[PDB]
Enzyme design. Structure first.
Site, PDB file in Angstrom:
ATOM      1  N   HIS A  41      -9.456   0.444  -6.448  1.00 42.44           N
ATOM      2  CA  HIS A  41      -8.909   1.081  -5.242  1.00 42.44           C
ATOM      3  C   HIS A  41      -8.191   2.407  -5.561  1.00 42.44           C
ATOM      4  O   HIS A  41      -7.864   3.161  -4.644  1.00 42.44           O
ATOM      5  CB  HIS A  41      -8.036   0.110  -4.404  1.00 42.44           C
ATOM      6  CG  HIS A  41      -6.684  -0.178  -4.969  1.00 42.44           C
ATOM      7  ND1 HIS A  41      -6.421  -1.341  -5.666  1.00 42.44           N
ATOM      8  CD2 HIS A  41      -5.550   0.547  -4.891  1.00 42.44           C
ATOM      9  CE1 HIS A  41      -5.149  -1.273  -6.009  1.00 42.44           C
ATOM     10  NE2 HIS A  41      -4.587  -0.155  -5.564  1.00 42.44           N
ATOM     11  N   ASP A  83     -11.467  -5.841  -8.388  1.00 46.99           N
ATOM     12  CA  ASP A  83     -10.653  -4.641  -8.317  1.00 46.99           C
ATOM     13  C   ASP A  83     -10.290  -4.108  -9.706  1.00 46.99           C
ATOM     14  O   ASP A  83      -9.155  -4.242 -10.164  1.00 46.99           O
ATOM     15  CB  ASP A  83      -9.428  -4.861  -7.417  1.00 46.99           C
ATOM     16  CG  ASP A  83      -8.682  -3.602  -6.996  1.00 46.99           C
ATOM     17  OD1 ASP A  83      -9.261  -2.495  -7.102  1.00 46.99           O
ATOM     18  OD2 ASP A  83      -7.529  -3.725  -6.549  1.00 46.99           O
ATOM     19  N   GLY A 174       2.375   2.295  -5.907  1.00 43.00           N
ATOM     20  CA  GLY A 174       2.462   3.189  -7.060  1.00 43.00           C
ATOM     21  C   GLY A 174       2.216   2.471  -8.373  1.00 43.00           C
ATOM     22  O   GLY A 174       1.842   3.102  -9.365  1.00 43.00           O
ATOM     23  N   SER A 176      -0.016  -0.061  -8.609  1.00 44.11           N
ATOM     24  CA  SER A 176      -1.446  -0.406  -8.537  1.00 44.11           C
ATOM     25  C   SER A 176      -2.204   0.043  -9.775  1.00 44.11           C
ATOM     26  O   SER A 176      -2.049   1.194 -10.201  1.00 44.11           O
ATOM     27  CB  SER A 176      -2.078   0.237  -7.313  1.00 44.11           C
ATOM     28  OG  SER A 176      -1.611  -0.382  -6.129  1.00 44.11           O
ATOM     29  N   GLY A 177      -2.984  -0.879 -10.338  1.00 44.24           N
ATOM     30  CA  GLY A 177      -3.776  -0.655 -11.539  1.00 44.24           C
ATOM     31  C   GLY A 177      -3.007  -0.805 -12.837  1.00 44.24           C
ATOM     32  O   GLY A 177      -3.588  -0.682 -13.911  1.00 44.24           O
TER      33      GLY A 177
END
Length: 224
Positions: A41, A83, A174, A176-177
């Site tokens: 994403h 994801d 922020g 994310s990942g």
């Protein structure tokens, strides 16, 4: 990171930041000198990769452009299954005392295992508070049976849940990942959670890295 604290200096050398126009877009992990692992994403045409410092914008940090990225073929924008994405750096990351490769897992950690999640995402929710220093929080892995009681049909066998009972301790916008590390290995990548973040007994959802090691190694070999 909600209800966290700044990470101890130099304890996250595998943590990276993905920036768009010098603004934080996503977190990530360095797999090797040419590759960064993050959420799908977080997809962009170009990336500015920050490495080698707990403080964003630090002159001592490394800044590398990344012009190519490869998402998992099974990634769905609607259900957020698979994801994960591999980001190819335009030049090699220089390994140092502040830049190190993450240890990819060989096994899946069981529920109840204490882990750490890190990032430069908002420290408050719904109110926005972006820190300059890297934030850390300790969370325990939650069994799919217990996590299903919360998110039901949203969960897939490749999604991992984490949190602390009756606690705000969690990841947020922020982060994310970014990495979820348990017992020395990367167990998850920040995928999704609640809004506002850090709602007690509502866990954070991560991409379970132990289910994708073949795709990670195969995709890296296919390109360069």
């Amino acid at each position: 990171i909600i209800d966290g604290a700044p990470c101890a200096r130099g304890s996250h050398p595998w943590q990276v930041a993905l920036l768009s126009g010098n603004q934080l877009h996503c977190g990530g992990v360095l797999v090797n000198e040419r590759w960064v692992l993050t959420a799908a994403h977080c997809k962009m045409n170009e990336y500015t990769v920050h490495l080698g410092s707990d403080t964003l914008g630090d002159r001592r940090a490394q800044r590398i452009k990344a012009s190519k990225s490869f998402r998992h073929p099974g990634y769905s924008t609607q259900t957020h299954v698979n994801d994960l994405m591999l980001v190819k750096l335009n030049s090699q990351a220089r390994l140092s005392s502040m830049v190190k490769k993450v240890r990819l897992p060989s096994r899946c950690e069981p529920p109840g295992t204490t882990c750490t999640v890190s990032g430069w995402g908002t420290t408050t929710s719904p109110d926005v508070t972006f820190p300059s220093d890297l934030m850390c929080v300790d969370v325990k892995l939650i069994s799919p049976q217990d996590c299903t009681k919360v998110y039901k049909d949203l969960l897939e066998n490749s999604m991992l849940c984490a949190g602390i009972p009756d606690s705000k301790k969690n990841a947020c916008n922020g982060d994310s990942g970014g990495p979820l590390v348990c017992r020395g290995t990367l167990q998850g990548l920040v995928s999704w959670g609640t809004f506002p973040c850090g709602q007690p007994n509502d866990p954070g959802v991560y991409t379970q890295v132990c289910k994708f090691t073949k795709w990670i190694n195969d995709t890296m070999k296919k390109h360069r």
